[PDB]
Paper text:
The [name] transporter system is composed of a periplasmic binding protein, [name], and a type I ABC-type importer consisting of a heterodimer of its transmembrane domain components, EppB and EppC, and a dimer of its nucleotide binding domain component, EppD. [name] binds free [name], but not metal–[name] complexes, restricting the ability of [name] [name] to use only weak metal–[name] complexes that can dissociate to free [name], making it imperative to determine the biophysical mechanism of [name]’s binding specificity before any improvements to its binding capabilities can be engineered. Based on its three-domain, bilobate structure, the β2β1β3βnβ4 configuration of the core β-sheet of Domain III, and the two-β-strand hinge, [name] is a Class II Cluster C periplasmic binding protein. In summary, [name]’s affinity for [name], EDDA, and EGTA, and its putative affinity for other APC chelators via molecular docking, suggests that it is a general binding protein for aminopolycarboxylates.
Soaking the crystals with [name] lowered their symmetry from P43212 to P212121, thereby doubling the molecules in the asymmetric unit to two; however, no [name] molecules could be placed unambiguously into the orthorhombic structure after refining the model with [name] in the ligand-binding cleft. Instead, two sulfate ions from the ammonium sulfate in the crystallization solution were present in the cleft of [name]. For both structures, all but the first four N-terminal residues (Gln27 through Leu30) of the mature protein (Gln27 through Glu563) were visible, and the C-terminal His-tag from pET30a(+) was visible through its first three His residues. Based on the relatively weak (e.g., no large, hydrophobic intermolecular interfaces) crystallographic and non-crystallographic protein–protein interactions in both the P43212 and P212121 crystal lattices, [name] is monomeric, which we confirmed by calculating a molecular mass of 63 kDa for the single chromatographic peak observed by analytical size-exclusion chromatography. Due to the high ammonium sulfate concentrations (1 to 2 M) in all of the conditions that [name] crystallized in, sulfate ions occupied [name]’s binding cleft, preventing formation of an [name]–[name] complex. When 100 mM [name] was added to the crystals, it caused the crystals to melt. To determine [name]’s [name]-binding mechanism, we resorted to molecular docking.
Author numbering: 31 to 564
Write the structure that this text describes.
């Protein structure tokens, strides 16, 4: 029995001074997390200490208004939808220039798909629904007027950049695509600022002397040590080369090794991630273009065994995920996977599905209805995730009694970004869930969207997602979106499995360091990090 909640784990009041080194698994070649080329957890983690945010995702997966930056953020009308931000008078950039509506307006123009068509952004996330964005004479009152209703307005302006500096480095596209992306940032609107960068080796941050927030900074230096071999991170922690690691693919062996390092003052936190494993099926081309084969495969897979073999030996009460739009703890979640018989390990039912669609078995091999042998299936998965490798082997075994063979494919070319309608039949990977399921769903289930890898193509799903994204609460949104989850599971192109475990492994002298098991991650509150007093 503990008195810590997910939001208060490892709370304390640190001393002043010292340093913390946090391992990251990518070199920094793009400093702009909102750009397509900078959109990953490493850039997000390294720049969270310097980028101000309107709202921040908390460990309980809620959005918290940043009261260091903002006095208030209010939905003041719905006819038309209007949001008013009041920026704190004391909020300033590291050169002393006030943070103002100039910074909101610049970011909106880079993200809204209209004012800067050449900006190489990741995604608009609804910034394009803001039609006008105006500020008062003081620069501290910002009014956003929307062209249509939008649920996820608190996810907007989560990363702000210094407009007055960007303005000195070309037009909007040039400053966003070059200055803010390619250059090591000399500026900050957060508790820390970059002092030096050794490419491929080390980012060194120091306190921002003009930090305006309530807490911190406590450290003389905050360092991010680049260790691209994720399997060497626990050794670096053991050896004192870093003080914190956050590896992506935890295993039983990793947990057991970390537990054996308690004599060095190492502890760890692990929680269900916003990242969730799935198997996608190529509905656009190849054998999986037949929905009957997709449903037979999903019915034959034994999800209980999948989890029993790869999670249950070292993770207690680990939840199945039976939705492709909601995590198990989100409003609207239900086991829509099992309701359809997917994941039940029911080989005889799967064989019936195939027989009833015209498939036949000959000499141990499945024949398609025309009489041609079904090809060996290409099952790809990215490197660096031992659980995915193990599950790929297990799935091969589950479908072998159907007369299907598989070729397992991995390595650097087997990532999601490199998927093509021509190069896979089955793909094991993960998606990163967002605070607003309807916003995430619009990025992955719509016909002409990059992350629709498996070929959903249903105007009704798209209509439902649009209505859900226009709702006035997450709960209403979830009630609407549930219908799209049902239809998506009917199509059998995306099979949810279970959430990845996080693993924050660290020297316990560091206080106010806690897991934040979502895309924003543990560096959401570096202003509070410090070392306990001896």
């Amino acid at each position: 029995v503990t008195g810590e909640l997910i939001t208060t784990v490892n709370s304390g009041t640190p001393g002043k001074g010292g340093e913390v080194t946090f391992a990251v698994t990518r070199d920094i070649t793009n400093w702009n997390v909102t750009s397509a080329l900078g959109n990953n957890a490493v850039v997000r983690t390294v720049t969270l200490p310097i980028v101000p945010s309107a709202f921040m995702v908390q460990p309980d997966f809620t959005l918290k208004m940043n009261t260091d930056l903002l006095e208030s953020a209010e939905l003041t009308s719905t006819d038309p939808q209007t949001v008013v931000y009041r920026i704190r008078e004391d909020a300033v950039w590291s050169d002393g220039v006030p943070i103002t509506g100039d910074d909101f307006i610049y970011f909106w123009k880079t993200q809204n798909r209209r004012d800067c068509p050449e900006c190489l952004i990741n995604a608009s996330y609804g910034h394009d629904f803001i039609e006008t964005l105006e500020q008062d004479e003081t620069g501290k009152v910002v009014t956003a007027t929307f062209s249509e209703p939008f649920l996820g307005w608190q996810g907007l302006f989560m990363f702000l950049y210094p407009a007055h500096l960007a303005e000195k480095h070309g037009d909007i596209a040039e400053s966003y695509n070059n200055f803010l992306s390619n250059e090591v940032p000399a500026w900050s609107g957060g508790p820390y600022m970059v002092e030096s960068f050794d490419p491929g080796q080390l980012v060194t941050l120091v306190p921002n002397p003009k930090w305006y927030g309530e807490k911190g900074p406590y450290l003389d230096k905050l360092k991010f040590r680049i260790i691209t071999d994720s399997t060497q991170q626990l050794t670096a922690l053991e050896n004192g080369e870093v003080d914190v690691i956050y590896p992506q693919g935890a295993t039983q062996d990793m947990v057991e090794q970390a537990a054996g390092l308690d004599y060095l003052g190492i502890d760890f936190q692990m929680n269900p991630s916003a990242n969730w494993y799935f198997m996608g099926l190529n509905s656009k081309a190849g054998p999986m273009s037949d929905i009957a084969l997709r449903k037979a495969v999903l019915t034959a897979i034994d999800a209980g065994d999948l989890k029993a073999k790869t999670a249950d030996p070292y993770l207690r009460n680990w939840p199945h995920m039976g939705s492709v739009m909601f995590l198990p703890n989100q409003a609207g979640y239900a086991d829509r996977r099992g309701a359809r018989g997917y994941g039940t390990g029911d080989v005889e039912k799967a064989k019936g599905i195939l027989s009833e669609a015209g498939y036949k078995l000959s000499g141990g091999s499945l024949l398609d209805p025309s009489g041609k042998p079904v090809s060996t299936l290409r099952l790809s998965f990215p490197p660096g995730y031992p659980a995915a490798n193990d599950m790929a082997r297990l799935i091969t075994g589950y479908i072998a009694p159907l007369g299907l063979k598989t070729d397992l494919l991995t390595g650097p070319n087997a990532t999601a970004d490199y998927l093509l309608s021509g190069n896979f039949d089955l793909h094991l990977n993960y998606f990163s869930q967002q605070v607003f399921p309807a916003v995430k769903a619009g990025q992955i289930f719509l016909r002409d969207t990059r992350q629709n890898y498996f070929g959903f193509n249903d105007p009704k799903i798209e209509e439902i997602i649009g209505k859900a994204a226009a709702a006035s609460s997450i709960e209403e949104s979830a009630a609407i979106l549930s219908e799209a989850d049902e239809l998506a599971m009917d199509y059998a192109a995306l099979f949810p499995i279970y959430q990845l475990p996080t693993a924050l492994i660290y020297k316990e002298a560091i206080l106010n360091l806690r897991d934040n098991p979502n895309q924003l991650g543990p560096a959401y509150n570096t202003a509070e990090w410090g070392l306990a007093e001896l």
